[PDB]
Each structure stands twice: as C-alpha cells, then as structure tokens.
C-alpha cells in the first residue's frame, strides 16, 4: 500500500516529532524512494536531531535524487491534509508489513523443509510471532502522570451531570458522560416522579434532558412537571382548578414559565427502537453544541426490540447492550427507568436487590449505576418513615454503594433533601 | 439529482465529521461513483476512523478508479463553496431517496398482486409509511369543566374519580368467576353508547347472540329467566319492555365481534376500520377475556404470551387513541384466603400486566362467599390502580335477575 505509506511519510515531514509516536523500520516501506525516505529519516533521529526537508536534503546532498528529489519531499508534505489520521495510516502501513513477512515466513517453511522437519516447525514458529507488531502496549508508568494532575487540581464541585439531590451527588459527582444508569422499582414508588425531578434539576444546571415517555403522553409529562415545579396541589388542577383553587395562579403562572424556560425535550412516539432514540440523540446533540445531553427513558421494557421474532430474555439483552453503546459512542448520560420482578412482593423485606431484575440478564452487567426506589409506607401503613423514599444505589462501577433517603411529597410529586 | 448529491459527498470530504450529522446509506446515491463514494466512506466510519481523500484512497488502493479516481474526490471537495447548506442538500438527497423507493414500492404492488391480495395491500402499506407544545396546556386547565372529560363509565360514583376513561388509557376489569365480570362490562358498554360513543365488544368466549340477549334483559329490566324459554306463554305486559329494549340495542353504537381466535393485531385492524368509518367520535374497545386472546408467538412461555398481549394492547390504545377495556381473570388462589378481596398480586401469570394497565379495577360480590352478608346484592368495584388519579372502593347494587347495576350514595 503506497497511499497510506505516503501519508505517514508526509505527516512526519510535517510534524518532525511523530517519528517517535509511531515506531517503524524502512523494511515497512516500498523499495527505493519510501524506503530511503525513512532510512535517512530514521537515521537523523537516532543521531539525536530533527527530521525536516531541509535537514534530510542536507544529509544526503549528492544522493538526494534517490529519494525522489526535493520536489517529492514537498509533495509528500503537501498530500497530508491533517496529521490526525496519522495513527490510522501508521497502522495500515503496519498491517501491510506483517502481511509481507507472514508470506515471507510462509514460503520460508516450504523451501526450508525439503533430517527431521521438527526444528522447522520451531524455527518457522519464532518468526511468525516476532512479526506480530502491535500498537497498544501497557505503560502504567506514563498514564499515571495523566491522573496525578486531576488528583491535584480537584474541582470540589460535581464534575458530571448533577442529580439534584445533595446526598446523592456526594457519591457520583454527577452522572458521567459514558454512564448508563438504571432507575428500577416496583409500581407506585415514585419511579416516574423521581425521573421527572432529575429531569428538571439537570435543566436548571443548564443541561439538555431528552425524556422518552413511551408509556405516557407529551402532556401528562408536562402536567407533572408543573405540579412539581410550582408546588401546586396535584388534585386541585386536574378538574377543579378553575373554581376550586385561588392564589395558586401565582405558583401556576410561574411554573408554566419554568417549564417553557427549560431544556426539557419530550418524545412520545408509541413504538421507539433503541435506534430511534439514537437518531433523536444525535440530532439534539447537533442542534445544541457545547452542552451535555441526558437521555431518559420511561420504561426499558416498553422499548421496541430489533429482532421481533426472538426470545423475550434476548430482547432486553439486545436493548440493554445497545443502550450502553449509545452512551459510550455518543458520549451522553443514558438514564433508563425499569421495572422489577413481581416476585419482590412475596418476601419479608420488600427491599429490591439486583437479582430482582427478572428477564433482563445482560442488564445488570451493562448498567453503571443501578438505583432502585423504595417507599416503605406502601407495604406498611404504620411506617416510622412516613413519606420517605429511599434511593438504593445497588451498583456503582466507578464509585461506592449505599442507601440515600429523600422526602417524597405525594401531593406535588416533589422530592426533598435530608441530613 | 446529482447536483445536490455532489454537495453532500463533497462537504463531507471537506468536514470528515459530517457523515455523522446526517445519516444516509449508499442506496441514496446514484450508482457507481457516488454510490461507492459513500459505501467506502461509510465503511471507514463504522470501523471507527476518519473520512478524507487520503484515507479513502488508502482503503481501496487498487479499486480507486471505480470512485472516479483521486482526481474526482478533489473536484467534489472543491465543488463545495461552504458547508453551511449541507443540511439543505442532505435533505434534497433524502427527498429523492423516498421518491425512488415510493415508486419501487408502488410498481411493487402491481407485480405483487399479480392466494388473496389482501395481505399484499397490507404488507405494501407498512413499507409505504419544548416550548411550542405547552401554550395549549394552559387552556387545558383553564378549560376545566367540572364534568366528565373522557368516556363516562355510567356510574356517578366512579366517574367522580376518573372523569371518563381517557383516550390512551388501558383499563383492566379483572375478577373471579360469578361476580358480574361480564354483566358489568355489558353495562358500561351501553352507557357509553348512550353518551354517543362507539363500543367495540370483542367476545371471544360468548356468541354475538348471548351478548345481545344480555343487553336486552339488562336494558328493558325484564327478568332473565322469563325470556329464555318460558317467555311466549309465561310472561305478559313485558312485551312493552321488550319492544322497547329491542329498539334500544338496535339504536345503539354497539359493535360485536365473535371470531373464535382473535390476535391483538386482529382487534387492531377492526379498530382502525371502525374509527375510519366513524369520524369525529370516540371509540372504546372491550375484550371479554384477556386470556382467550390469541398470542403472537404460539411456541412461547405462557407468562410471556400475556406480556406480549398486554404490551401490545397498551400500544394500541396509545397509538390509535382509543379507550381499551380488557376483562381478565384472577388467580384461583384468591379463594384460599380469609379476605376474598382481590389485590394486584392476584394477577397470576401476567407480569407485564399490572405495569401496562392504567386503571386496574377488580370486582367483588360479597354475597358469593358469604350466604349471610350485610351487603345483600352489592358488588364493590375496587380501583386498585389509577395512574392519573386516586384509588379506593366504589359500591354498586347488582340486580342478579336483570344483570343491571345501580348507583348509590
């Protein structure tokens, strides 16, 4: 391959310091030109100098035409649009080098064989391994310095996207960018209101929240965001409102402003594939530069799978795995509400654990911050924790676990901080 | 269109980060060049790399000429004045893509239609297919009425909680056998047809006849046992209540489907059809047995079938915008307790059930388990789940003889 071979040579003549960031030998390059363009290029490096046209042409003064002349070195440096592809090209050159020697050691065996062909399979073995030159080595001695800076310069203040709960962010330091958090819980625990809360809290820290409600409508999601924002009574508005509530219009004509002054985006298409959400995530991330994006999903199970004719347990796996990829490759916080096995209610301790994620197998594995919700005053009419939802972080990949308590105001769908 | 097609290919070769900002497949582009220009262009992206002349030409080293040669990639990159109209051009390319397939799926029908051409027009159909939205929200609350917004149940004490089953809701009327599970449905059936709404009754258990035979004995208040056989030479002056009920049922908007095996998709089709023939008016879809519905995957676990049904049933209500009422049955395990009063956990197999339901309402006749009940002839409808409302128990008087329900308090 000559095309990728030029790029490497050129990008080096452009950045005379890249000969280090990628180790090669003239053996990799084509005969004559490219070969000599590196041989002389590499020599000036081992002698502890720089590598540019001027220097190279200054080295082989009489034997310059053997490198395609000076008119070629400049053409090589001209061909390189941007030295960003260097890695990618320096690898294409490398793959083709293995390929060259792989055959050279292959047709080597044939000629070698025809005492005993044992020492052959041994000599032809040592060569086939040394020809395996890769690009990702392990150096804990280098990437350590990269961390140190960050340890030193410690921004004592939530790094990622804040949840809006002081006692929770003091563990996560903001849901990161590649993370895939899971908000699962039994029905009637605030599973939805807890989401719509974090939804706004993020929209207040000036982030973008994409709420995918496959269960509810674009309206109810707002109708809830209002009754939660202005602290107005949920039952009042519904129907009474007009001739039943007064002086609340102040808290209403305020909330209606807040929601319209927020970065909340709501999608309510009935059937949403992980790929659908993907597309709507790029689009939102494109229209909104510089700012972080969070993708909420109101029901992991109501999502539309990729393979219609497949086992249910495999569909949730297909979804889960895909959902994670999105967060990673698109670099956005992915929050997915889920449901827990109906089997939770047939125990003495109604407190959810990981095994309660029924069908979903590849679920708990792809999740970064599995957090269950638990209202004690649902299973017990006489609880010592009146109106207290306890958010249980059962899994944290880059952090600790534990239970966080919050006050749930059933009437406003609001959550309050404690301790 | 090749002109806008160049702009797209070019502006991408200019900004090797725009292949992402606008999704396409080689299928969109003209054959040969433009095609291969994207095929190879897209491939390098999926492999997690960059897309520029240098890289593209480095990929297909021998087969470079099939992309118009290197001299063409540069001409494309030069053709782009500014990468600002990339959106406008990436749309002109997309518009022409639909137009290409719209014909490819149109002349598809022609050759296809050429068993029954029914599944054709169906298969050829599926292929052929915030601040802004909050100002109305204001007027919604302002347009508070004080009465029933959605579809009324017909029970004053119940509608004072739901304000009419909404449009996207999926309510569940579950209960043990012999509680009025069916008669309670056939009651709401008419009450909705009186409020001038359309009720699609899917009785998979009974016949198109018995459903009417019950609607009459309930409408005219005539005795259920009389008519059956005696009627002719056993009842008198009831012909007035009969020649009145027979009219009511024929003057109603009740539609009864009684095909033996009904898939959720079957009901779906019969719902669009009824909604199309009847414009402007709301439609309610009743199902006399959630378990007698035919699943999608025959060879699957039973607990997954009820989930396949339930999940599908909800989507229908949401995407078709109609009230979906599904009668169900409760685990036989209810009768082995002291309090025969049903709860959510009693929904046996069905797991993804209670989660997709909006208004789970169980029925309970106390005078079935107790011969000496203080509530003689009293069914108590128990709303155990209300997503956009409150819970609680509502009491109604059940007239066993007429299959009629009466209001109280």
Tokens 């003057």, residue located: B251
Residues of chain B found within 8 Å of residue A7, distances taken between Cβ atoms: 54-55, 58
Contact (CB<8Å) B61/A1? yes
| H/E element, A5 | helix A3-14
3-state helix, strand, coil in chain A (%, to 5): 50, 15, 40
Contact (CB<8Å) B163/A238? yes
Q: List beta partners, residue B329.
A: B175
- Output DSSP code: residue A381: T
B54 vs A79, A217, A346: nearest CB: A79
Contact (CB<8Å) B145/A243? no
Distance from CA of B61 to the nearest CA of A (A): 7
B142 vs A3, A81, A242: nearest CB: A242
Contact (CB<8Å) B137/A1? no
- Retrieve residue A404's tokens: 């966080």
Distance from CA of B406 to the nearest CA of A (A): 25
Distance from CA of B397 to the nearest CA of A (A): 28
For chain A, the first-to-last Cα distance in angstroms comes to: 65
Experimentally, how was this structure solved? X-ray
Contact (CB<8Å) B54/A341? no
Which of B16, B145, B355 is the best mutation test for A, with the most CBs of A within 10 A? B355
Helix and strand totals (H; E) in chain B:
17, 9
Which of A82, A232, A237, A260 is the best mutation test for B, with the most CBs of B within 10 A? A260
Angle in degrees, CA A201, A206, A207, rounded to 5? 80
Tell me the C-alpha distance between A344 and A373, whole Å: 13
Distance from CA of B379 to the nearest CA of A (A): 26
| H/E element, B310 | helix B302-320
Chain A residue closest in CA terms to B310: A302
Distance from CA of B328 to the nearest CA of A (A): 18
Yes or no: say if B197 and B282 are a contact pair by the CB < 8 Å rule.
yes
Q: Choose which CATH entry (2.30.110.10, 1.10.860.10, 3.40.50.150, 3.90.79.10) describes domain A1-145.
A: 1.10.860.10
Chain A residue closest in CA terms to B349: A342
Which of B17, B24, B86, B141 is the best mutation test for A, with the most CBs of A within 10 A? B141
Distance from CA of B399 to the nearest CA of A (A): 33
Note the Cα B191 to chain centre separation in Å: 23
Chain B residue closest in CA terms to A1: B61
Yes or no: say if B153 and B162 are a contact pair by the CB < 8 Å rule.
yes
B144 vs A81, A242, A342: nearest CB: A242
Strand bridging mode A293-298 / A264-267: unpaired
User: Which of A163, A217, A222 is closest to A406 using CA atoms?
Assistant: A163
Tell which CATH architecture fits domain A146-419. Answer: 3-Layer(aba) Sandwich (3.40)
Residues of chain A found within 8 Å of residue B386, distances taken between Cβ atoms: none
Yes or no: say if B307 and B259 are a contact pair by the CB < 8 Å rule.
no
Residues of chain B found within 8 Å of residue A312, distances taken between Cβ atoms: 300, 304, 307
Distance from CA of B60 to the nearest CA of A (A): 10
Whole-number Cα distances in Å, A366 to A214, A274, B282: 22, 15, 43
Residues of chain B found within 8 Å of residue A235, distances taken between Cβ atoms: 390
3-state helix, strand, coil in chain B (%, to 5): 50, 15, 35
B351 vs A239, A279, A342: nearest CB: A342
Yes or no: say if A307 and A231 are a contact pair by the CB < 8 Å rule.
no
Contact (CB<8Å) B57/A217? no
Contact (CB<8Å) A341/B319? no
Distance from CA of A188 to the nearest CA of B (A): 9
Yes or no: say if A374 and A389 are a contact pair by the CB < 8 Å rule.
yes
Q: List beta partners, residue A354.
A: none
Distance from CA of A122 to the nearest CA of B (A): 35
Tell me the C-alpha distance between A359 and B303, whole Å: 11
Tell me the C-alpha distance between B27 and A3, whole Å: 27
Tell me the C-alpha distance between B85 and B83, whole Å: 6
Contact (CB<8Å) B149/A85? no
B406 Rama sector, left if φ>0, alpha if ψ -120 to 50, beta otherwise: beta
Contact (CB<8Å) B23/A279? yes
CB B287: neighbour CB atoms within 10 A? 27
Contact residues for B207 (Cβ-Cβ < 8 A; gap 6+): B258
Contact (CB<8Å) A81/B57? no
Contact (CB<8Å) A81/B53? yes
| H/E element, A185 | strand A180-185
Residues of chain A found within 8 Å of residue B20, distances taken between Cβ atoms: 282
Contact residues for A260 (Cβ-Cβ < 8 A; gap 6+): B130, B131, B134
User: Which of A399, A414, A419 is closest to A172 using CA atoms?
Assistant: A399
| Yes or no: domain B130-409 corresponds to CATH 3.40.50.300 | yes
DSSP assignment of B241-293 equals HHHHHHHHHHTS-EEEE--SS-BHHHHHHHHHHHHHHS-SS-EEEEEE-SSSS
Contact (CB<8Å) A256/B138? yes
Residues of chain B found within 8 Å of residue A261, distances taken between Cβ atoms: 131
Q: Is B135 exposed, middle or buried (0-12, 13-18, 19+ CB in 10 A)?
A: exposed
CB B391: neighbour CB atoms within 10 A? 14
Domain ranges (residues) in chain A: 1-145, 146-419
Note the Cα B148 to chain centre separation in Å: 23
Tell me the C-alpha distance between A267 and A273, whole Å: 12
Helices marked H in A288-408: 312-330, 362-366
- Retrieve residue A155's tokens: 């921004």
B54 vs A80, A222, A339: nearest CB: A80
Residues of chain A found within 8 Å of residue B140, distances taken between Cβ atoms: 219, 223
Query: Residue A128: CA atoms inside 13 Å, Cβ hemisphere, count?
Result: 12
B54 vs A81, A266, A282: nearest CB: A81
Q: Choose which CATH entry (3.40.50.1970, 3.10.20.90, 2.30.30.60, 1.10.860.10) describes domain B1-129.
A: 1.10.860.10
- Do A146-419 and A1-145 have the same topology in CATH? no
Contact (CB<8Å) B137/A188? no
Handedness of CA A354, A359, A364, A370 (dihedral sign): negative
User: Which of B269, B272, B267 is closest to B289 using CA atoms?
Assistant: B267
Contact (CB<8Å) B168/A217? yes
Distance from CA of A180 to the nearest CA of B (A): 21
Contact (CB<8Å) A282/B23? yes
Map residue A20 onto helix, strand or coil: helix
Query: Residue B162: CA atoms inside 13 Å, Cβ hemisphere, count?
Result: 30
Residues of chain B found within 8 Å of residue A410, distances taken between Cβ atoms: none
Tell me the C-alpha distance between A242 and A238, whole Å: 10
Tell me the C-alpha distance between B33 and B72, whole Å: 9
Contact (CB<8Å) B54/A7? yes
Q: List beta partners, residue B398.
A: B405
Contact (CB<8Å) A286/B141? no
């Amino acid at each position: 391959n000559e095309y990728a071979e030029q790029a490497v040579l050129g990008s080096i003549l452009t950045e005379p310091e890249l000969i280090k960031e990628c180790p090669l030998t003239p053996e990799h390059f084509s005969p004559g030109k490219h070969f000599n363009i590196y041989f002389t290029m590499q020599d000036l490096d081992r002698k502890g100098q720089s590598v540019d046209f001027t220097s190279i042409a200054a080295r082989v003064g009489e034997k310059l035409p053997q490198l395609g002349g000076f008119g070629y070195l400049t053409e090589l440096a001209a061909s390189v649009a941007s030295t960003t592809t260097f890695k990618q090209h320096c690898q294409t050159v490398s793959e083709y080098f293995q390929k060259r020697k792989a055959i050279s050691i292959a047709q080597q065996i044939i000629e070698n064989v025809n005492v005993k062909p044992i020492q052959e399979a041994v000599s032809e073995l040592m060569e086939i391994e040394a020809s395996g030159t890769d690009d990702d080595d392990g150096s804990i001695d280098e990437a350590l310095v990269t961390v140190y800076e960050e340890i030193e310069s410690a921004d004592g203040n939530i790094t990622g996207v804040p949840s809006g709960f002081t006692e929770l962010d003091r563990m996560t330091y903001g849901y990161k960018r590649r993370n895939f958090v899971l908000i699962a819980a039994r029905p009637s625990m605030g599973k939805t209101a807890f989401a719509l809360k974090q939804a706004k809290n993020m929209s207040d820290n000036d982030d973008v929240v994409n709420l995918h409600s496959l269960e509810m409508g674009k309206k109810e999601n707002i109708k809830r965001l209002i009754v939660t924002a202005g602290s107005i009574n949920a039952q009042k508005i519904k129907a009474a409102r007009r001739d039943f509530a007064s002086e609340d219009w102040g808290k209403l004509s305020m909330a209606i402003g807040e929601i319209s002054n927020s970065n909340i985006n709501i999608f309510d298409k009935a059937g949403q594939s992980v790929n659908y959400i993907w597309s709507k995530t790029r689009q939102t991330k494109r229209k909104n530069p510089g700012k972080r994006v969070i993708v909420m999903i109101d029901y992991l199970q109501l999502l539309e799978p990729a393979k219609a004719n497949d086992s249910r347990t495999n569909q949730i796996s297909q979804i889960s795995r895909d959902l994670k990829k999105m967060a990673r490759e698109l670099d956005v916080v992915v929050i997915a509400l889920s449901q827990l096995s109906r089997q939770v209610e047939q125990r003495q301790d109604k407190r959810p654990m990981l095994s309660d994620l029924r069908e979903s197998g590849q679920l708990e594995q792809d999740a970064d911050i599995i957090e269950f919700l638990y209202r004690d005053d649902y299973y017990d009419k006489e609880s010592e924790s009146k109106n207290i939802v306890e958010v249980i972080i059962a899994k944290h990949r880059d952090g600790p676990v534990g239970t966080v308590s919050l006050a749930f105001i059933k009437e406003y769908g609001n959550f309050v901080n404690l301790e």
